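Protocol step 4 of 6.
Sequence for Mannitol-specific cryptic phosphotransferase enzyme IIA component (Escherichia coli) entered exactly as in the expression construct, tag removed. Do not edit the line below.
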Amino acid sequence: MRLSDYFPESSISVIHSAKDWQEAIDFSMVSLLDKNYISENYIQAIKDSTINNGPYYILAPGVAMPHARPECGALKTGMSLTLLEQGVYFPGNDEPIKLLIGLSAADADSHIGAIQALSELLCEEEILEQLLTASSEKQLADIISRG
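Step 5 output, structure tokens:
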């Protein structure tokens, strides 16, 4: 699938460090919230679950995918991509996360389609290296355009 189809515009960020574990989820989601792909409750569902148990979607050491079910407050279907130069430690995870990709979907089938698209990035260690070393939002965006 074209990866770019899920990325509106403001969806791609490089950050020195998130302020805390909650702000890392917020920076993974704010670009979707800003175009109302989601409601505010959608972010808080991920935060509350993370506090209660831990991050659901860890795909490799240092790599996460903040997301909640459509019914938690998604409104449309899209993604985000956020890199933290120093990372941040999520509770109950084994090490700090440096790379986060946001996802929202209006329906479970749209969620499956979106997941199958981003698996072409999150399940390819060659892409994970290039995302983790990305000097800029431009280098992050190139990897999206490559999909």
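Step 6, annotate. The first strand starts at residue 12 and ends at 15.
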